[PDB]
Write a structure and sequence with these properties.
Elements (H helix, E strand, L loop, with lengths): L15 E3 L2 E4 L2 E2 L1
Antiparallel strand pairs: 1-2, 2-3
Family: Belongs to the cyclotide family. Moebius subfamily.
Protein name: Kalata-B1
Length: 29
């Protein structure tokens, strides 16, 4: 969804970093 990885960390648990956003299972968080 709107999970960002600007700080190098996501709020959503088990989310992968994809600066400046976050993805999980190949899908945006």
């Amino acid at each position: 969804a709107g999970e960002t990885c600007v700080g190098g960390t996501c709020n959503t648990p088990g989310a992968t970093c994809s600066w400046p956003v976050c993805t999980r299972n190949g899908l945006p968080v």
